[PDB]
Amino acid sequence: KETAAAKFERQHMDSSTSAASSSNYCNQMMKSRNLTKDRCKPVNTFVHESLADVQAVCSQKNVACKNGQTNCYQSYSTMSITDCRETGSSKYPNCAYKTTQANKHIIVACEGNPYVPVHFDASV
User: Is 24 among the annotated ligand-binding positions?
Assistant: First the structure.
């Protein structure tokens, strides 16, 4: 079965591209990472840094999570990310997304031993 750590990698990691991300990127990636299977996942962020760099965030700046839990961490450095947001006219199963590249600090929730990212909370 897929661990929470693995699910985070599937939903949020894309080290293969530096940033770029074509206008088609979110349409392709949301589908291929299985985020459009049951519904169109409304919003999702992909991070274009190494797994080690993203994992390292769990030892960086401790910040409150949006849900009020205390196990979130903000990256000290900006990271290359791509925001995917479902378009107004997107209709399942044909999920359509606006692709937006950015360089922002990420905030992830971390859990477990080893202490690793399990949710993407925000970018700031």
Answer: no
